[PDB]
Amino acid sequence: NSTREKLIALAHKFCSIISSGDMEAVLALRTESCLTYQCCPSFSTRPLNNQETREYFEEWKHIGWNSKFWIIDEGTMVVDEAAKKIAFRAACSADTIGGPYENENLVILQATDDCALVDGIWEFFDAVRKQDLMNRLAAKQAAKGLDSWCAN
Amino acid sequence: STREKLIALAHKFCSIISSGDMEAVLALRTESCLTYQCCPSFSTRPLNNQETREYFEEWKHIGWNSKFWIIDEGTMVVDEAAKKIAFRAACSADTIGGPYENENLVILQATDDCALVDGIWEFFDAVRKQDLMNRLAAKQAAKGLDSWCAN
């Protein structure tokens, strides 16, 4: 197992864990000091720690179900063996209170040195897809939970 | 080292974009270079060199003082074996519709000697871009960009 393969495996594992909906597995993949950065300035860009990530995912689960997250377009993946970083394109989908949701993402992971844990997460998503979901949720009185994390 | 040549290509990419020099922009690309915009709220059809030129000309007709620069340098991902680099960038411009600011993630596929760009993938804040399109449309200045961006 080269470093490149471990990083690719970590990215797929990251996505599968999220797809499975298992909160304990999510946190077990992260270092204690892991931070998540959402990188669309139309939404909050304040980094979230592991406890805040759990709370945010709970708000998601209140409004969505059948959540899936998977790597797409794998040939465009960028693997940095020296720095233990990987950038990959991903897609996600869910049924929600506001109707079907689909988004596409760019994720960067900072791995630990043995490539077993995630120490940093940067996410880009389509902000219009997300804002449209938030608008549909707000029309159904279901947006305040996600808004308290998402809004500027 | 391949690593510094990739990061150098990323810096040159942003410098040349910021200069607005279309000839220099095209000189940095292979003949077969494709540009992929990756926000599905906008067109995701790949653009070749000639289409990219026309697209940038449409930007120049509504905007000026365009800047494009690398940010958060420590977050870059440099893939020496595959000759790829992913980096965060920001951009700004003044426009007919008022000021524009966006933030981006760019992936470059370089040639084997790291001298040319052979593929570009870009993510941007689609709300920032849609808000600009709305402001342009309120000044009847959106038709050119919409023909490249919409759908």
- DSSP assignment of A91-131 equals EEEEEETTEEEEEEEEEEEEEPTTSSSEEEEEEEE-HHHHH
Compute the half-sphere exposure of residue A39: CA atoms within 13 Å on the CB side of its CA.
25
Resolution (Å units): 2.1
Q: Pairing between strand B77-79 and B63-70?
A: unpaired
* Structure tokens that stand for B96 in this block: 């007919």
The Cα B128–Cα A30 span in angstroms is 31
The Cα B35–Cα A35 span in angstroms is 31
- Residue A34's H or E segment, with its range, is strand A30-38
Of B68, B136, B128, the C-alpha closest to B102 is B128
Encode B109-122: b = buried (16+ Cβ within 10 Å), e = exposed.
Answer: bbeeebebbbbbbb
- Residue B52's H or E segment, with its range, is helix B49-62
Angle between helices A127-139 and B126-137 (to 10 degrees): 80
Region of residue A128 (phi > 0: left; psi between -120 and 50: alpha; otherwise: beta): alpha
Q: Closest to B127 (Cβ–Cβ): which among A85, A122, A127?
A: A127
The Cα B141–Cα B151 span in angstroms is 18
A99 burial type by CB count under 10 A (0-12 exposed, 13-18 middle, 19+ buried):
exposed
| A43 and A121 Cβ atoms separated by less than 8 Å | no
Q: How many helices (H) and strands (E) does chain A have?
A: 5, 6
* Structure tokens that stand for A44 in this block: 């909050």
B130 contacts chain A (CB < 8 A): yes
A80 contacts chain B (CB < 8 A): yes
Interface test with B, best of A72, A128, A133 (most B CBs within 10 A): A128
Encode A58-72: b = buried (16+ Cβ within 10 Å), e = exposed.
Answer: ebbeebbeebebebe
| B96 and B62 Cβ atoms separated by less than 8 Å | yes
Contacts of A40 in chain B (CB under 8 A): 103, 125-127
* Structure tokens that stand for B128 in this block: 């920032």
Of B100, B97, B94, the C-alpha closest to B137 is B97
* Structure tokens that stand for A131 in this block: 């804002």
Looking at residue A77, its amino acid is M
Min Cα–Cα distance to chain A from B22, Å: 26
* Structure tokens that stand for A115 in this block: 């490539």
| A66 and A100 Cβ atoms separated by less than 8 Å | no
The Cα A78–Cα A76 span in angstroms is 6
The Cα B77–Cα A138 span in angstroms is 37
* Structure tokens that stand for A126 in this block: 């389509």
Residue whose pair of structure tokens reads 């289409």 in the numeric block: B51
Looking at residue A12, its amino acid is H
Min Cα–Cα distance to chain A from B129, Å: 9
Q: Please give the method by which this entry was determined.
A: X-ray
Residues 9-38 of A with CB under 8 A from B: none
Size of interface A-B (CB pairs under 8 A): 85
Looking at residue B144, its amino acid is G
B3 in helix, strand or coil?
A: helix
Q: Pairing between strand B29-37 and B117-124?
A: parallel
B39 burial type by CB count under 10 A (0-12 exposed, 13-18 middle, 19+ buried):
buried
Looking at residue B125, its amino acid is D
B51 burial type by CB count under 10 A (0-12 exposed, 13-18 middle, 19+ buried):
middle
Of B146, B102, B106, the C-alpha closest to B123 is B106
**Other Cβ atoms closer than 10 A to B14:** 21
B70 in helix, strand or coil?
A: strand
| Contact between chains at B107 and A87 (C-beta distance less than 8 A) | yes
| A38 and A45 Cβ atoms separated by less than 8 Å | yes
Least CA distance to A81: which residue of chain B? B79
**Other Cβ atoms closer than 10 A to B59:** 17
Looking at residue B11, its amino acid is H
The Cα A101–Cα A93 span in angstroms is 5
A143 in helix, strand or coil?
A: coil
Q: Closest to B75 (Cβ–Cβ): which among A76, A102, A122?
A: A122
Which whole-number Å values give the CA distances from A139 to A43, A132, A146, B128, in the listed order? Answer: 19, 11, 14, 22
Rg (CA), chain B: 15
Compute the half-sphere exposure of residue B88: CA atoms within 13 Å on the CB side of its CA.
20
Q: Would you say how long chain A is, in residues?
A: 152
| A152 and A146 Cβ atoms separated by less than 8 Å | no
Q: Closest to B86 (Cβ–Cβ): which among A4, A108, A126?
A: A108
Q: Report DSSP letters for B85-145, one per residue.
A: EEEEEEEEEEETTS-EEEEEEEEEEEPTTS-SEEEEEEEE-HHHHHHHHHHHHTTT--HHH
* Structure tokens that stand for A50 in this block: 């592991």
